């Protein structure tokens, strides 16, 4: 059978970056050339192997991670990067061996007056391990006083809301990202 990229890339709604959705892909044949010969991606870079030469290759399992971030933040989706997304939302390992795919989704994810469904983790005590997924909504203690589940000065809700409006600058507009990690049941 063919691998279910259709339900990942053409999905109706994507997840918030802090709760990035992961799909495991196994026991199928995957044509990667139909993805790279679409030309409808603003970013599609591979770390580890060329796309045209990974269609000639097999892997035990293939993971597909998807989320929505800012255009200015699609840099941080790469090995060895720093920033609010790479540090507190979605980290790739230094020895990453997959492909990062992103495209502009302003027409779908931004509405007049602001779209606020998509969130990101702004406050965190320490950096994420690679492929860690944090969903805790514990109030963040930014001072010397216990916060105690109630917000206020130095007591902040860790997840902040994106403000996607269609008038935003390109880099500030929503972008959908798909991260294909390779680690034998998937071939081409």
């Amino acid at each position, epitope marked *: 059978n063919l691998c279910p990229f259709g339900e990942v890339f053409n999905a109706t709604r994507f997840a918030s970056v802090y709760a990035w959705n992961r799909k495991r892909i196994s026991n199928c044949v995957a044509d990667y050339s139909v993805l790279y010969n679409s030309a409808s991606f603003s970013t599609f870079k591979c770390y580890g192997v060329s796309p045209t030469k990974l269609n000639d290759l097999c892997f035990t399992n293939v993971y597909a991670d998807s989320f929505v971030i800012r255009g*200015d933040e699609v840099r941080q989706i790469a090995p060895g990067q*720093t*920033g609010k997304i790479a*540090d*507190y939302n979605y980290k790739l390992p230094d020895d990453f061996t997959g492909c990062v795919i992103a495209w502009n989704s302003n027409n779908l994810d931004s509405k007049v007056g*602001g779209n606020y469904n998509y969130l990101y983790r*702004l*406050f*965190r*005590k*320490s*950096n994420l391990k690679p492929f860690e997924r944090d969903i805790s909504t514990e109030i*963040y*203690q*930014a*001072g*010397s006083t216990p916060c105690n589940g109630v917000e206020g*000065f*130095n007591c*902040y809700f860790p997840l*902040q809301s994106y*403000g*996607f*409006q269609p*008038t*935003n*600058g*390109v880099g*500030y507009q929503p972008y959908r990202v798909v991260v294909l990690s390779f680690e034998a049941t998937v071939c081409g």
Partner: antibody
Amino acid sequence: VQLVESGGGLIQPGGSLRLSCAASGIIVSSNYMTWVRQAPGKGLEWVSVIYSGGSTFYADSVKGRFTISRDNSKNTLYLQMSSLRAEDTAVYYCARDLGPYGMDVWGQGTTVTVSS
Amino acid sequence: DIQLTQSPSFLSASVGDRVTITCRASQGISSDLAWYQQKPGKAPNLLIYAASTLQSGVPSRFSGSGSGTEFTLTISSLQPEDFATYYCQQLNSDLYTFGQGTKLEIKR
């Protein structure tokens, strides 16, 4: 809850200086901490930040010369200034960045003069 | 980077007047704008974040409004201590872009 700044004076052009930001009520170890400078009449310029995770980002006019550090024990924020030039002669501030909520807590400033 | 241009660099008015300071963005930062007030010999003070939200403690005569590219600060009834310099600032910016600044003076 305040931010007290110290450690700045006359430095030769080319030398090094270290500013210090002693926090109170705020833990520099768990916030975004900011350094801005301000030359007379030339307004506010951002310098660098240290995240609550260690990540340090800089302004391309300070990259290679300024280094941010942090002491959890002494709850102090530092800014190491090196290869100094005359263009750095300004008042240096440490504030706290709250992202979309602004920069609410500011220090008092330390004047740093760099001259022959 | 976006470029914030702050409209009246110099502005003069009298006590009890209403003034409006404008900050224009190059490309559209939605509502991520903050206003500051710097009195002579003091550090800046946060007045407004999220375009229009009043920081806790700021008097009610201050109010922000804007969304997209054009924003404004309004002081309802200008007071003797309001004569200072005001800075607008992009929020969630990688380079912490401030504006040139607006100085407020006494009319004559």
